[PDB]
């Protein structure tokens, strides 16, 4: 009896994907979920993960490769690798040279999710929902406190977003940028932030319990769809702000000590099927990395410029870089100050 252990982000697969794979292959899948790159990286660095497949963001995988925690993918066992978009492969290869270890799964941006009606009520019809000003100017966040604010519990993403907003290199190597301006601004915003969390904000936006969030694009579009299906009158939207935003590429990778390698390759080749992954995108509102799948994706998802953004918006996106120990120290120390402010 073959088994397969998979660790993926929460809210990142269609409801029937695993069952359909089990039915086709006779493999039993053990599926577990996380909402933090830090949790996954900690598990990878502390010992065996016990998983056959894990799904880091590519910028985290970039440094994880150098610790030897992954084994290279046997492309001879991934015949339809060909379906993957070559331009996305090239971007991911900046993190994973020659695409040896990582299979691109989904990608999106770190932007602003918000309740349309509540934000306009508080900040007026002309609320700047196209700008990080909406949530990174203290005067606006003090007012939005009235209906609830959440930030992601994602330190590398939040500091890069703040640095970009301040006109600094999103990947600044100047320690003073973190300890000075970035911390100063975050500590001014902190009293108005209800919580730091990277998954509770989906249902809280959908149900009207918060009105604005730093969020991952497809998560917010899921919240919007859950609100529509509830017929609760909640109108949620998402913005890639005008100052730019961070892009991420989530990738499947195989732990070096994976027990069930043959089954893992079966699952990866299953995900490379254009109809399988288009069906996932249809349900999670994330762009997949599979060029053959794009026309199969629902018009609702494929034509949303907050999911598949056009070239002029993609040109404004930035990605995370590896930092040295000093910046890791000052960034992490500053993050701890902010979450307890
Ligand atoms: Cl099962
Ligand atoms: Cl929840």
From Swiss-Prot:
Binding site for putrescine: 10, 219, 250
Coiled coil segments of this chain: none
GO molecular function, one term: putrescine binding
Regulation: Transport is feedback inhibited by intracellular polyamines.
Compartments reported by the entry: Periplasm
Pfam families hit by this protein: SBP_bac_8
Biological process terms in GO annotation: putrescine transport
Function: Part of the ABC transporter complex PotFGHI involved in putrescine uptake. Binds putrescine. Imports putrescine for maintenance of the optimal concentration of polyamines necessary for cell growth in the presence of glucose.
Sequence similarity: Belongs to the bacterial solute-binding protein PotD/PotF family.
Designated name of the protein: Putrescine-binding periplasmic protein PotF
Gene: potF
